Amino acid sequence: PRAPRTYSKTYSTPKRPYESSRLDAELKLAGEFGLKNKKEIYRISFQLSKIRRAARDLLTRDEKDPKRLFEGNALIRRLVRVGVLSEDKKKLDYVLALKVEDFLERRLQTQVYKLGLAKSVHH
Amino acid sequence: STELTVQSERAFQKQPHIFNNPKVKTSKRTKRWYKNAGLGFKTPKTAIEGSYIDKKCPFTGLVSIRGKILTGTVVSTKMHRTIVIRRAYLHYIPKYNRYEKRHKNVPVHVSPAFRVQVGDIVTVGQCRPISKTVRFNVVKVSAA
Amino acid sequence: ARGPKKHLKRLAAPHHWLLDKLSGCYAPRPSAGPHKLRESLPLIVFLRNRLKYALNGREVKAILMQRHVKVDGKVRTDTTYPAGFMDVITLDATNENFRLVYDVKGRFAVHRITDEEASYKLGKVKKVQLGKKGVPYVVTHDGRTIRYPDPNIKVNDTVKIDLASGKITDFIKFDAGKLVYVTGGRNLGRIGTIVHKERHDGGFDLVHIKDSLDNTFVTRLNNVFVIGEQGKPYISLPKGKGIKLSIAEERDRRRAQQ
Amino acid sequence: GISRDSRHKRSATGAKRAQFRKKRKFELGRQPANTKIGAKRIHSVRTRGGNKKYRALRIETGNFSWASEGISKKTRIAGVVYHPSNNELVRTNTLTKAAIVQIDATPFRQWFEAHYGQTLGKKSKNAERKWAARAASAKIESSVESQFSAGRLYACISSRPGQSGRCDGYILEGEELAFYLRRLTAK
RNA sequence: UAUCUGGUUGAUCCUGCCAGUAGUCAUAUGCUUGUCUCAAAGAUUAAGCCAUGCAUGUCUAAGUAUAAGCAAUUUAUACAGUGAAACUGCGAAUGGCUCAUUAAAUCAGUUAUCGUUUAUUUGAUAGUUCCUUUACUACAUGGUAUAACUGUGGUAAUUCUAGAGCUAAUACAUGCUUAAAAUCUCGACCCUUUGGAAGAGAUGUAUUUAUUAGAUAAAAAAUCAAUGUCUUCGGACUCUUUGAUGAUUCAUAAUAACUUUUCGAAUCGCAUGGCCUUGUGCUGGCGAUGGUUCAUUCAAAUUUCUGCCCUAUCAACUUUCGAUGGUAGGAUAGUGGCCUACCAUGGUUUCAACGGGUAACGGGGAAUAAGGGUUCGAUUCCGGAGAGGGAGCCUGAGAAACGGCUACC
RNA sequence: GGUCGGAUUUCCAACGGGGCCUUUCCUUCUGGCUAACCUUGAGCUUGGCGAACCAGGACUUUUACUUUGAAAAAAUUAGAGUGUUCAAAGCAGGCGUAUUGCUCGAAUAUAUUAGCAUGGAAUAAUAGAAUAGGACG
RNA sequence: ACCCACUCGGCACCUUACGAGAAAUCAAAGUCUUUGGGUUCUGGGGGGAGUAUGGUCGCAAGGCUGAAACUUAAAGGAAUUG
RNA sequence: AGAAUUUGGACAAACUUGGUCAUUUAGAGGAACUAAAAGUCGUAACAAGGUUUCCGUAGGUGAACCUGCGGAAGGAUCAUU
RNA sequence: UCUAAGGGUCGGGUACGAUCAACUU
RNA sequence: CUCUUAAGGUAGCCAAAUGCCUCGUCAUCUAAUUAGUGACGCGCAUGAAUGGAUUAACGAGAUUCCCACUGUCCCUAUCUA
Ligand SMILES: [Mg+2]
């Protein structure tokens, strides 16, 4: 008898467990960005899919719909704010197909490398 | 109705708190009390000029019409001062996106002011529990 | 069952109190009073969540029976006294007064009024009857029974009370073009300048309402509170004046100043 | 005890409703009074929310009203002569509502002489002044003076003895008397 | 995030299932287990059984204190400091747990009470109670018992109690003090007729019954029954009073009565002030508690419409003894076959009645999902029901109460 | 682009709305505002037809369907803002001379079906005047 | 009675495939992923099994309705080469 | 004022004997189904399977099965102007 | 000791009244 | 496989009123059963109008068990004509 605490999980495993294409693709992201897990990769695919889901449904709505305008710009602004969405791409269509590793670029682990001071992502 | 031989019951049939003084003489020998149910339903001329008592009548009785107003076709008129109407509607099943026919029998009370036959279209008004199963009172018949 | 319920769990209290779900299982149950349970301030919410003049339920109490807070000119040393629509809460300390008026979003707002305004309040009459020995009376929305009113005061009319006696100083009739405050429903907390009303004889009267920006909406007669005429109202409206600007316009305003 | 609910006896379709919700107090019934005549003994009953309810037993007298004359007098009840609901209530002289009874009928006679003064059945100048004003109004109906000869007027109890604790009624007049005379005189 | 793959053949295209695959806020189990936040947890089988210890008591300035308790007011020789115990008043009908029963039942959304009860709040609301009401009276206030306590005992025991002796009330218990005015009843006497009178009673509220009012879309005339406020007895005639609902026999008022008769303060703390013909004389605040009625609030009970899983190897069911309805009455807080007496033969059903099963409390909701859907919901909220199985009942506003009682198993 | 990426007027266009006429009443009586007034006083005056606002009246062919609106507790689902250091979370928080204090929030979306009000009137039904008590009067 | 031409209705037949089907084949078995004219019945891997039991019909033989336990990775269709 | 006790009534626990329904469960004996085993007897089907095969029905035989009547091509014939 | 139901014969200008008598439940 | 008949007892049924052995064997009924019932069947010596197998209703027919009931009995006593 108390207010329950909302909690959700932040990853989803791929449907096919063993395929050479995905396994070799994920390991590319691990080494290039210094990730300890495939769950480190599945997490972005979960967030990217949710962001893509929201944009996919909003685009089916007719233009100038007050819901599409309010949530569309909020979603663009939030993505632009963290740098994952470039400034010139604000048309609610580049949101759909940004990349798997565009979010992975803004990670502080790989962001330190860009501003020197580590000379390796592991460092 | 057949005027229901008003004094058939063992008890004297009278409108409560309606006293006609035998000391004086006045036209309309039997003083009568009648009310209008409101909501646009109009008192039939039978109710005003009738001789029944029927304390459950919505126009001359002690009952009042309030709540849901329903309509249905008469399907059974074999009881005394009470008939059964049937409400036919359609029920929506969202899996198949199409409807289905359903019905519900409603026992309703009919005043002697109305003559209802099987097939008559009658609108009813909700009243206080009249009996175990009767909660509606016939208020207008619109069939000939 | 078996009697009245003396407890009110959280997640069952009205949402306009804005009580956080965590940090507690129960909520202050408003005791019997002049207002419905579902529409009530009660002071512990006012003094701990609205004014921040206290932090626990204890110092809310310790404020009460030292007689710093009075509701409508009476002390009301009760933790959960139900205060509803447009009640005057006078705090002797700091010589400041209060009025309970809905914000634009429908929540109770901290409205500060001058001392002279705290000398009166309005009430939406609910019934006009004949008392014992043929004495007419009116019953406002807060249960205040006023005997011997003006004969012109019919139902759904606002009367003005003196907050020192039960006498009625003035009243406003019900008609199109009068200023109205919305109490309840989706449009709760808006000022709407009644344009016309539709009867639907049989119950649940409907009245059409058009605010200052021509954003018309329809609300039931049970949720409409006449507060005066076009232009000046009979009370001090809170900031925003209940216009209900669109959600796409709030973010325009929120970015205007920062 | 006696239940007044409907989770007992069958639904309108004949189905037998199952056991549910053991008898609640707010749907209780109680034993009938079966009020009698003589030796007034009224027992108070405590009801919901207090509200003392008087279960009258063996009531002796009651307030009866003369509808035409608009007066009410206290008279002794002689017995029960007719009851539409049951004859066993007549046989046992039970007093319920709408029971035709015969009453003392004397106190109405002294009022008639004090008001009109002429007669029933068969000095100061101020008395005639009232009598002169109340003239041509002592011809109520022939079926009532005949009862005054036997000193027992028929009446109908209009109160509920087991609920209010009293027994009150009115004098049968006009059509009510005519209707109940063909019931009594039939043999 | 709309995806498939292996298996029948010597080989091939199909149907088709088996197997694989991914998820479960679905459990269990094995191996392993460094950190932080958060967190379910005897539901499943047994609503099976329970040792033990707790889980409901409570006081202010303001009901009652001679503790033969504690210190000390010193403002007090009656009390007014604190304060065990006990009577009194409230509470214990909330909360907490569980899911056994339950399939138009519960429950969801949506209506009604013009068909009822309502402790407690919140706002108003009793000049009318000395009874043959000019001694009958205490109205600067009227009686009784009892607890605590003292003392004597019973049994081994229980929150067991007896006999004897006091004292209290916001316990019980009777019981008045406040106008007037107006109106209806009888009515002495003058006696006139146009009739007036002296005098007395009744008239709060609550209960019960009967009766009356509770009107109202429009305007002018005829003369009768007699004048009807005042008359130039021509008649000017107007003032003539009426609220709410969609709707009432509504609110409310009036008349006649009935009641073994409710209420109309014999209560408590503080401040102590003004008036004089200075008497323990008269007025005088801030409150607390109580009290009849109405309204409000917290509710409760009943109730309208639509909606529930699998079953025909369940097709007819209900109606003796209640089934469907009428009348009348009882009972209820109220409507109602809720029950009784008489009467009628009615009522449901292939649009799935009735019966059976449920490893069924119902919903808000959860899992997986292109779309549709499929499965789940003992369990943080809402509403039900239960306290080992049944039944019955006291107290109270509220219980068919079980950390209440009684009986049976 | 007459303001320096922000809006307006007379606009060529498209898109959906309202009213009127073409045989086309798409009910109206007692009355108020008499209203939009033939109403004009000399260029701002004394006087038209009631719903455009109403109170009461007579009937009103009934459904399905669809638009909109109120309703459908909170939590939960989606979603806006924001330092839990990120995140699941939570509804906080932010800004000053920090010596006196100021202030934005805690929205919104979703919510089968049943019930209520409103516009539409295609689609699919229903009834009307035929051994005429048929309608206007 | 025949011949020619046309037309309605019928039992059929021949060729071809825009079309369908896994194919054999099909003017319907076509107008079905570019999936919706109306409607009734029936099937959900193979055995057990149309068996057991209960109903109901029959003189009977039997008809209609109709499981479960258990067992199994194939049964089956049409074509190709041997 | 008033305890024990007491008459009738409604509510009705519970027990005994019957009846019915449902679920488990014993049983001599009988008759099936499935699996396994290199069992015994035959060769009924698949080729015109050596009597074409199958369907309904009836009777019979150690067993596969045989025969009578009516039907079918899933026939071994799309065919005799 | 009561209650109820079950009948015959007579009277209507061109819905009832009176009298009588059975044991059946 | 063999001797053999006119044919070699089919469908049924059974220690049956028909089975010698025999108080057949198994199960049930009981504390205990040559009794009863249900099965089994190389049946001295069952069997089809010598009619076979069933069969509702019926019977002063034969037999077994159970309930009720009791002087049948334990175990006798008493009364009347
Ligand atoms: Mg509270």
Q: DSSP assignment, residue A35?
A: -
Distance of CA A10 to the CA centre of its chain: 12
Q: How far apart are CA C255 and CA D67, in angstroms?
A: 84
| Chain B residue whose CA is closest to C200 | B39
Residue type, C195: V
- Among D63, D86, D87, D83, residue whose Cα is nearest residue D171: D63
Nucleotide closest to D91 measured between CA and C1'? I2
Nearest to C25 among A2, A5, A70 (CB): A2
Query: Would you state the structure tokens that stand for residue D122, as one six-digit string?
Result: 């068969």
D87 Cβ nearer than 7 Å to chain I strand: yes
**A65 contacts chain C (CB < 8 A):** no
Distance of CA C123 to the CA centre of its chain: 9
Q: How far is CA B27 from CA B20, B31, B32, in A?
A: 11, 9, 12
* Segment (H or E) for B44: none
Q: How far is CA B18 from CA B110, C90, C144, D70, in A?
A: 23, 58, 39, 14
With 0-12 / 13-18 / 19 or more C-beta atoms within 10 angstroms meaning exposed / middle / buried, residue B137 is buried
Q: Are strands C168-172 and C158-161 parallel, antiparallel or unpaired?
A: antiparallel
Q: How far apart are CA C161 and CA C158, in angstroms?
A: 10
3-state secondary structure of D155: strand
Residue type, D29: G
Q: Which bases along strand E come within 7 Å of a protein CB atom?
A: 1, 3, 21-25, 38-40, 92-97, 101-105, 111-115, 117-125, 186-191, 195-197, 205-212, 243-249, 251-253, 255-260, 293-307, 317-318, 322-342, 344-355, 372-374, 380-386, 390-393, 395-402
Whether chains C and A touch (3+ CB pairs under 8 A) is answered by: yes
Chain D residues with CB under 8 Å of B9 CB are: 84
Resolution of this entry, Å? 4.8
* Distance from CA(D23) to C1'(E105), angstroms, rounded: 16
- Among C19, C24, D138, D150, residue whose Cα is nearest residue B23: D138
* Closest CA–CA distance from residue C25 to any residue of chain A (Å): 5
**Within a 10 A sphere around the Cβ of D185, how many other Cβ atoms?**
7
Question: A1 vs C21: CB contact, 8 Å cut-off?
Answer: no
- Among C11, C251, C125, B44, residue whose Cα is nearest residue A72: C251
D2 Cβ nearer than 7 Å to chain H strand: yes
3-state secondary structure of A95: coil
Q: How far apart are CA C74 and CA C41, in angstroms?
A: 16
**Within a 10 A sphere around the Cβ of C19, how many other Cβ atoms?**
18
Q: How far apart are CA C47 and CA C38, in angstroms?
A: 19
Query: Would you state the structure tokens that stand for residue B29, as one six-digit string?
Result: 């020998």
3-state secondary structure of B141: strand
Q: How far apart are CA C63 and CA C79, in angstroms?
A: 10
* Distance from CA(B68) to C1'(H11), angstroms, rounded: 39
Q: How many residues does chain B have?
A: 144
Interface of C with B in 142-201 (CB under 8 A): 201
* Distance from CA(C11) to C1'(E95), angstroms, rounded: 17
* Closest CA–CA distance from residue B66 to any residue of chain C (Å): 8
* Distance from CA(B129) to C1'(E352), angstroms, rounded: 29
Query: Would you state the structure tokens that stand for residue D102, as one six-digit string?
Result: 């015969």
- Among C66, A114, C74, D179, residue whose Cα is nearest residue B9: D179
Q: How far apart are CA A9 and CA A11, in angstroms?
A: 6
Which residues, in sequence order, are bridge partners of residue B38?
A: B41
With 0-12 / 13-18 / 19 or more C-beta atoms within 10 angstroms meaning exposed / middle / buried, residue C41 is buried
* Closest CA–CA distance from residue D38 to any residue of chain B (Å): 26
Can you give chain C as a three-state secondary structure string?
Answer: CCCCCCCCECCCCCHHHCCCCCCCCECCCCCCCCCCCCCCCCHHHHHHHHCCCCCCHHHHHHHHCCCCEEECCECCCCCCCCCCCCCEEEECHHHECCEEEECCCCCEEEECCCCCHHHCEEEECCEEEECCCCCEEEECCCCCEEECCCCCCCCCCEEEECCCCCCEEEEECCCCCCEEEECCCCCCCCECCEEEEECCCCCCCEEEEECCCCCEEEEEHHHEEEEECCCCECCCCCCCCCCCCCHHHHHHHHHHCC
Chain C residues with CB under 8 Å of B40 CB are: 201
Using the mean position of ligand 1's atoms as its centre, give its distance from the Cα of residue D162 in Å. Answer: 42
| Chain D residue whose CA is closest to B131 | D12
Mark residue C204 as left, alpha or beta (left: phi above 0; alpha: psi -120 to 50; beta: remaining).
left
Q: End-to-end CA distance of chain B, in Å?
A: 16
* Segment (H or E) for D72: strand D71-82
Distance of CA C82 to the CA centre of its chain: 11
Chain D residues with a Cβ under 8 Å from any Cβ in chain B: 6, 12, 67-68, 84-85, 98, 137, 140-141, 173-176, 179-180, 183
Chain A residues with CB under 8 Å of C247 CB are: 66, 70
Using the mean position of ligand 1's atoms as its centre, give its distance from the Cα of residue C5 in Å. Answer: 10
* Distance from CA(B28) to C1'(H38), angstroms, rounded: 118
Domains and CATH numbers, chain D: 1-30 (no CATH), 31-105+152-187 (no CATH), 106-151 (1.10.168.20)
* Distance from CA(D97) to C1'(I1), angstroms, rounded: 27
Q: Are strands B69-76 and B82-93 parallel, antiparallel or unpaired?
A: antiparallel
Q: How far apart are CA D159 and CA D59, in angstroms?
A: 12
With 0-12 / 13-18 / 19 or more C-beta atoms within 10 angstroms meaning exposed / middle / buried, residue B99 is exposed
| Chain B residue whose CA is closest to D9 | B132
- Among D61, D152, D36, D169, residue whose Cα is nearest residue D103: D152
Q: How far apart are CA B75 and CA D66, in angstroms?
A: 49
Q: How far is CA B41 from CA B139, C38, C113, in A?
A: 7, 38, 52
Nucleotide closest to B5 measured between CA and C1'? I15
Question: C9 vs A1: CB contact, 8 Å cut-off?
Answer: yes
Q: Which bases along strand I come within 7 Å of a protein CB atom?
A: 2-4, 15
C226 neighbors C140 (Cβ within 8 angstroms): no
| Chain B residue whose CA is closest to C204 | B67
Q: Which bases along strand F come within 7 Å of a protein CB atom?
A: 53-55, 59, 62-65, 69-82, 87-92, 104-109, 112-114, 116-118
| Chain B residue whose CA is closest to C202 | B39
Q: How far apart are CA A43 and CA A51, in angstroms?
A: 12
**B17 contacts chain D (CB < 8 A):** no
Long-range contacts of A1-10 (CB under 8 A, 24+ apart): A1/C9, A1/C25, A2/C25, A3/C10, A3/C11, A3/C21, A3/C22, A3/C25, A5/C22, A10/A43, A10/A46, A10/A47
A58 neighbors A67 (Cβ within 8 angstroms): yes
Question: A3 vs C25: CB contact, 8 Å cut-off?
Answer: yes
* Distance from CA(B101) to C1'(G65), angstroms, rounded: 29
D31 Cβ nearer than 7 Å to chain H strand: yes
Q: DSSP assignment, residue B3?
A: G
What is the rounded radius of gyration, in angstroms, for the C-alpha atoms of chain C? 19
Chain C residues with CB under 8 Å of B38 CB are: 201
Q: End-to-end CA distance of chain D, in Å?
A: 43
Q: How far apart are CA A91 and CA A100, in angstroms?
A: 19
Q: How far is CA C247 from CA A92, C190, C216, C217, D26, in A?
A: 20, 16, 17, 17, 52
Nearest to B7 among D68, D140, D179 (CB): D179
